[PDB]
């Protein structure tokens, strides 16, 4: 999508970027991009997240847009959940986006940027059985986004549907469960097209 | 206030998992004086379900 | 008068008669107080020790308070005892019940011929009374022994308001020139019958 | 989207003496205050604290 929208300089900020099969991602990244890099940053660490400030300070053009993508959260209803488990799993679900959003705002990478999008599920608007920690995470990010938006920053929380490209051809069953519940996938590039032009203007 | 967020989550976590039990979330203003408890319970007993 | 059971002339006679009996009570040696305890709790304390005999349950305006009136000596020691048990209590005010069965003879020397001289007629609509908590019959209304019970007995206002709401009264209007009667009406009405059935007070 | 209950926004009655109400709060003074309020209206209640 960034290639289709003509992004000349792009950086990938996550540990997956130097352990996954990203040669296909770099290959589609041959279109429109003039500079492409991977940090292999562990987003759980504030010191390693702060290293991302070099990406705007370096001789490459300055940072102007940010997209934190959807994340896995484990299953759990109200049974098999307690005050020992909850304080571990909710921290794990939020540590990344919270510390990134904080540090980027503390040193002007936020506001020095036209869009800054935080991922959450559309399923978290009414909520669903068996996903308590994920519901809590989406609720917390929905609050944190407004706190910065009211300060004058173009931060937005996106409650997206499932990305069609993320339906693994090895196992459609997570999509089949949602399809019976009446939530259907859509192309991630079309969801980005319907939202990322907006935050500076509406 | 972001630290309130587990309350909205726990409400919806009940609505789909003990679906026979009636419940409601009321969100107060954090800085105005809180209302009389008979007003809170009164308007809530007009909801069947959730 | 509003029920059509009396002419304005009958009403003018009866009020001006009952006023003279009311003076003889109000000028007397006795007193009254409110205590934040219900009829059962106060009527039990009336038996619980011999030292506090000499005052009685004069009104039941609401579930949460009842009025004690009689000899000022009984009123004082009742009021202390409930603050020691931990309830709230009002400051003393004038008497509100007859203080002797001689006073009953002083009233019966007055009301009999006066009441027999009223041009009563059968009610157009149900008249409820704080002497009864029930509809007055056409054979009862004509007796001076009814109208004298307001000075003798408990003012059973709660039981009257409860029969209005058993009998389908949705909305309840208050001619509050003295005693703020819409307040006691709301607090006695709003905890009985089905949940969420309407109740308008004005 | 939040809609005001400007239409029909009146509380109605609490559902009779079927059982007690339990009040738990971060503030003991708030829990006690609502237990006093439910007493004025003839509703049985118990105060709880952490």
3-state SS of C95-109 is: CCCCCCHHHHHHHHH
> Does any CB of chain B come closer than 8 Å to the CB of residue D38?
yes
Contact D37 B41 (CB under 8 A): no
Residue A56 tokens, joined: 């705007």
Q: Which of D4, D7, D14 to mutate to test the interface with B (most CBs of B within 10 A)?
A: D14
Contact B13 A135 (CB under 8 A): yes
| Cα(C118)–Cα(D38) distance, integer angstroms | 45
Paired residues of D24 in beta bridges: D48
Do chains A and D meet with 3 or more Cβ pairs nearer than 8 Å?
no
| Cα(A66)–Cα(A85) distance, integer angstroms | 31
Which residue in this structure is represented by tokens 């051809």? A169
For B9, the closest of A77, A139, A144 (CB atoms) is: A139
Contact B16 A129 (CB under 8 A): yes
Residue C139 tokens, joined: 């054979």
Paired residues of A120 in beta bridges: A159
Q: Which of C39, C69, C77, C91 is nearest to C150 (CA)?
A: C69
Residue A194 tokens, joined: 């319907």
Residue A104 tokens, joined: 């980027």
Resolution given for this structure, in angstroms: 4.0
Neighbours of A148 (CB within 10 A): 19
Cα diameter, chain B: 34
Question: Residue C11 contacts by C-beta under 8 Å, 6 or more apart in sequence?
Answer: C1
For B43, nearest residue in chain D (alpha carbons): D11
Ramachandran bin of A108, using left for φ above 0, alpha for ψ from -120 to 50, beta for the remaining angles:
left
Residue C61 tokens, joined: 């305006």
Residue D25 tokens, joined: 């709060």
For C187, nearest residue in chain B (alpha carbons): B38
For A136, the closest of B5, B15, B18 (CB atoms) is: B5
Closest-CA distance, A34 to chain B, in angstroms, reads: 40
* Angle in degrees, CA A7, A10, A11, rounded to 5: 160
Bridge pairing between strands C55-59 and C66-70: antiparallel
Give the residue before each break in chain A, using a C-to-N cut-off of over 2.5 angstroms; say none if it is continuous.
none
Residue C201 tokens, joined: 């007070």
Contacts of C196 in chain B (CB under 8 A): 45-46
Closest-CA distance, C184 to chain D, in angstroms, reads: 10
Report how far apart, in Å, the C-alpha atoms of A33 and of each of A4, A9, A27 are. Answer: 9, 6, 11
> What are the b/e assignments for A73-93, b being 16+ CB within 10 Å?
beebeeeeeeeeeeeebbeeb
Cβ atoms of C154 and C42 within 8 Å: the answer is no
Residue ranges in A107-187 assigned as alpha helix (H): 132-149, 173-180
| Cα(C62)–Cα(C60) distance, integer angstroms | 6
Residue D24 tokens, joined: 């738990």
Q: Which of C13, C16, C11 is nearest to C1 (CA)?
A: C11
Task: Report helix, strand or coil for A35.
Answer: strand
Closest-CA distance, C16 to chain B, in angstroms, reads: 41
Cβ atoms of C75 and C69 within 8 Å: the answer is yes
| Cα(A103)–Cα(A110) distance, integer angstroms | 9
Cβ atoms of A164 and A187 within 8 Å: the answer is yes
Cβ atoms of C76 and C35 within 8 Å: the answer is no
Contact C63 D41 (CB under 8 A): yes
Q: Which of C178, C194, C191 is nearest to C62 (CA)?
A: C191
Closest-CA distance, B7 to chain D, in angstroms, reads: 14
Signed CA dihedral, C184, C38, C87, D36: sign only: negative
Question: Residue C40 contacts by C-beta under 8 Å, 6 or more apart in sequence?
Answer: none
Residue D3 tokens, joined: 């809609």
Neighbours of A158 (CB within 10 A): 20
Cβ atoms of A123 and A170 within 8 Å: the answer is no
| Cα(C140)–Cα(C146) distance, integer angstroms | 7
Bridge pairing between strands A9-12 and A35-38: parallel
| Cα(C59)–Cα(C161) distance, integer angstroms | 14
Which residue in this structure is represented by tokens 């109208």? C147
* Angle in degrees, CA C155, C158, C162, rounded to 5: 140
| Cα(C62)–Cα(C189) distance, integer angstroms | 9
The alpha carbon of residue A29 and the mean position of all alpha carbons in its chain are separated, in whole angstroms, by 19
| Cα(A86)–Cα(A79) distance, integer angstroms | 12
Which residue in this structure is represented by tokens 């003039």? A34
Task: Show which subunits contact C, needing at least 3 CB pairs below 8 angstroms.
Answer: B, D
> Does any CB of chain B come closer than 8 Å to the CB of residue A77?
yes
Paired residues of C68 in beta bridges: C33, C57
Residue C39 tokens, joined: 């009829």
Q: What are phi and psi for residue D21, nearest 5 degrees?
A: -105, 135
Closest-CA distance, C199 to chain D, in angstroms, reads: 5
| Cα(C68)–Cα(C97) distance, integer angstroms | 10
> Does any CB of chain B come closer than 8 Å to the CB of residue A140?
yes
> Does any CB of chain B come closer than 8 Å to the CB of residue D36?
no
| Cα(A187)–Cα(A194) distance, integer angstroms | 11
Residue ranges in A21-70 assigned as alpha helix (H): 23-28, 46-50, 54-57
> Does any CB of chain C come closer than 8 Å to the CB of residue B46?
yes
Task: Name the E strands within A51-196.
Answer: 65-68, 115-121, 155-160
Closest-CA distance, C188 to chain D, in angstroms, reads: 7
Report how far apart, in Å, the C-alpha atoms of C61 and of each of A10, A191, C128, C178 are. Answer: 76, 64, 15, 14
Question: Residue A1 contacts by C-beta under 8 Å, 6 or more apart in sequence?
Answer: A188, A189, A192, A193
Residue A74 tokens, joined: 């484990």
Q: Provide long-range contacts, Cβ within 8 A and 24+ apart, for A147-152.
A: A147/B2, A148/A101, A148/A105, A148/A110, A152/A111
| Cα(C134)–Cα(C156) distance, integer angstroms | 10
């Amino acid at each position: 999508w960034l290639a289709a929208r003509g992004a000349r300089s792009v950086v990938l900020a996550g540990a997956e970027s130097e352990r996954g099969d990203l040669a296909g991602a770099r290959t589609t990244g041959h279109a429109g991009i003039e500079r492409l890099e991977h940090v292999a940053v562990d987003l759980s660490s504030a010191a390693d997240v702060a290293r991302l400030a070099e990406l705007c300070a370096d001789g490459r053009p300055p940072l102007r847009g940010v997209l934190l993508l959807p994340q896995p959260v484990a299953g759990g209803g109200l049974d098999e959940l307690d005050g020992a488990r909850f304080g571990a799993e909710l921290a794990g679900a939020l540590r990344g986006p919270v510390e990134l959003t904080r540090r980027f705002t503390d040193v002007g990478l936020t506001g020095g940027t036209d869009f800054f999008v935080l991922s959450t599920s559309v399923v978290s608007l009414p909520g669903r059985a068996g996903t308590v920690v994920g519901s809590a995470a989406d609720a917390f990010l929905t609050a944190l986004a407004r706190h910065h938006r009211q300060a004058g920053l173009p931060v937005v929380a996106a409650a997206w549907g499932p990305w069609l490209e993320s339906v693994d051809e090895s196992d459609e069953a997570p999509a089949v469960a949602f399809a019976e519940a009446g939530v259907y996938p859509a192309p991630g590039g079309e969801m980005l097209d319907a939202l990322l032009p907006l935050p500076a203007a509406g | 206030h972001p630290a309130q967020a587990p309350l909205t989550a726990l409400f919806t976590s009940l609505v789909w998992e003990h679906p026979e039990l009636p419940c409601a979330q009321v969100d107060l203003d954090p800085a105005e004086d809180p209302p009389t408890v008979v007003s809170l319970l009164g308007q809530v007993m007009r909801l069947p379900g959730a | 008068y509003a029920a059509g059971a009396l002419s304005l002339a009958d009403g003018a006679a009866l009020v001006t008669a009952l006023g003279r009996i009311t003076e003889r009570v109000a000028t007397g040696p006795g007193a009254s107080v409110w205590v934040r305890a219900t009829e059962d709790e106060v009527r039990a304390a009336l038996s619980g020790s011999q030292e506090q005999v000499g005052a009685a349950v004069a009104a039941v305006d609401e579930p949460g308070t009842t009025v004690v009136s009689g000899d000022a000596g009984a009123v004082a020691r009742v009021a202390a005892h409930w603050r020691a048990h931990g309830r709230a209590t009002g400051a003393p005010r004038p008497a509100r019940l007859l203080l002797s069965p001689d006073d009953e003879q002083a009233a019966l020397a007055e009301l009999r011929a006066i009441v027999a001289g009223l041009a009563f007629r059968e009610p157009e609509v149900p008249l409820l009374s704080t002497v009864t908590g029930q509809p007055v019959e056409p054979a009862e209304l004509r007796s001076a022994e009814h109208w004298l019970d307001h000075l003798r007995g408990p003012t059973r206002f709660l039981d009257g308001v409860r029969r209005l709401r058993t009998d389908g009264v949705t909305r309840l209007v208050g001619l509050d020139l003295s005693g703020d009667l819409t307040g006691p009406a709301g607090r006695s009405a709003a905890g009985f019958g089905e949940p969420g059935r309407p109740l308008l007070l004005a | 989207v939040w809609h005001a209950l400007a239409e029909d926004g009146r509380p109605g009655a609490i559902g009779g003496g079927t059982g007690s109400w339990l009040v738990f709060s971060d503030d003991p003074e708030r829990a006690a205050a609502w237990c006093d309020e439910l007493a004025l209206f003839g509703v049985p209640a118990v105060a709880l604290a952490g």
